[PDB]
Amino acid sequence: RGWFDILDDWLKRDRFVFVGWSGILLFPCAYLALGGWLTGTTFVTSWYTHGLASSYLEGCNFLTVAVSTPANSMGHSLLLLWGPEAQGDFTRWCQLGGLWTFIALHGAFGLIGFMLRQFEIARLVGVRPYNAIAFSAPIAVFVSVFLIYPLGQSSWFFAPSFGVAAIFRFLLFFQGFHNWTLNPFHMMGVAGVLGGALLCAIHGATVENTLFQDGEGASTFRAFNPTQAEETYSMVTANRFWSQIFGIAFSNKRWLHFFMLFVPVTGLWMSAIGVVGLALNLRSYDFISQEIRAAEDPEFETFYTKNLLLNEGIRAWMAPQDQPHENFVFPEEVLPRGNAL
Amino acid sequence: PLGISGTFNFMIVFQAEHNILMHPFHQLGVAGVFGGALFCAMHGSLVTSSLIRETTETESANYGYKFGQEEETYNIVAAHGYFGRLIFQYASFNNSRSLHFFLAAWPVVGVWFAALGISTMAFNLNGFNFNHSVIDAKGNVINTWADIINRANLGMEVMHERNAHNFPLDLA
Amino acid sequence: DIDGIREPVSGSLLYGNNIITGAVVPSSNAIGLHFYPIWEAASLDEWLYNGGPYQLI
Amino acid sequence: MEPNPNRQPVELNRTSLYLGLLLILVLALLFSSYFFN
């Protein structure tokens, strides 16, 4: 019972906010990621890196504020406050985008801390660590999209900027440049997100609608006791209901709840894999058979050819302002447009 | 359209014409389905984490539950004990009926707002428009991310149905 | 002809689509919100040209 | 000669067969367009 074990004791006290050994990584990293976001969105510009206003101080609202990525000329610089770009100058570091790598990197360490916290608590309380296991999906998304994607591109400039409108810009960029809707890894992501939202709704509604009458109240929440042995709702009646409505039904509650982990977790992990390909511009952009046919046959048209026309408009119309380091000048006469518009 | 690519076509054109991403009912929709997925995984993982030992390691733990048994198959008290410490005690549900109601309500209400976003953009009440909202002391436009969105939207608008418009405004 | 401009869009597998590109294509902009059941068309061939299956479905 | 005591039998129940065949078939229906390109 030396200092290590005494520290262990204190870290693990049962308090309002549990700490743990994981807390030593988690709390500072999460606090700084969140504080850096609130600080930048409130006070910091993106004039020098993007040519955008991005803070309440400049007149943006909650939808348009962001902490934006550094200039493309920074490449993948760590952009450390004491590094060769900012050279210890906190003001210049803000102006160069240092808050972006600040938030992304403390955010990444903070997510590691959070998952260690899920393991540490599961271990103390004596439960299996499936919550931590499930959290690997948020981690695969954060790491693929905020780190691997820009690392395969020219610079952090092309990572998502931390902001509501900014993230919307990132969605529309992926459509126009990567045709990311066409990508079967994104499509599996969608199915596991929408599938998970479906499972969340249908299971909550099923339990609430197959409840046992366990009190006299017409408001039925009080007729449950945490320590009760008995199921609060009828699996047998639920099972019959869905067997007869939909054709199949769950009959095994352990399977049901495992599947609820599996589906959205698996979806997120699939979308992450697609984004790793996009880091390299390795897209599902085209169906070659479609293009060969359409090039030779000017009457052949599908919704697939239509969406590429939209993509070509997005790229030509947005690139000069979205990618200012390229100094694009596209004369009016080259801009792709249909009739009238 | 009834088809995979045609669905994306409908989305991109909807973005051009209504700026749906900047609409709060679609934002509630996203919170509803991302949150439905999050809570689905959360509930899955917490129930799974607290299954009561009923099986050996060479068999699926699923065999530990029998269809129609009267006794609950996991320990809610251990699950809450876990999740209340993950965050803090009062942020965790100790009432299964409350929890399940929340699982029903969160995705359903968000998705009702998504549906209502589409159904009200149907009458052209559109997403927030902050195009040129930020102006300097002289009157120069200082773009924000809303203006970058606007340029992507313009690309969609000018290209869609490239032979169908004869007049300068796309009014329906 | 989804947009009513005599520019027909191919939705089906046998007319050059795969599962991802394929669709049943919306009815013609010339129709608008008019109800277009099979018996309003002079023929199945017309009904198909104008996107009648979309409304039936 | 002496048998291995670590042997275990393996099981796939019918529901798992159905779930698995659905996964496989749906994945194939999804990826087939890309394999033909």
Binding site: V236, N239, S243, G247, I248, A249, S251 | K66, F67, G68 | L13, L14, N18, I19 | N13, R14, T15, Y18, L21, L22, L25, V26, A28, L29, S32, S33, F36
Partner: peptide
């Protein structure tokens, strides 16, 4: 060949629905 393949996979999935519903392992209270 491609169309045949797509329709073939679809028809298998429809058959699978039939067996999964009408020839499911029956749920038993036990």
């Amino acid at each position: 060949m491609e169309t045949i393949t797509y329709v073939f996979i679809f028809a298998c999935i429809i058959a699978l629905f039939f067996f999964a519903i009408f020839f499911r392992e029956p749920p038993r209270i036990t």
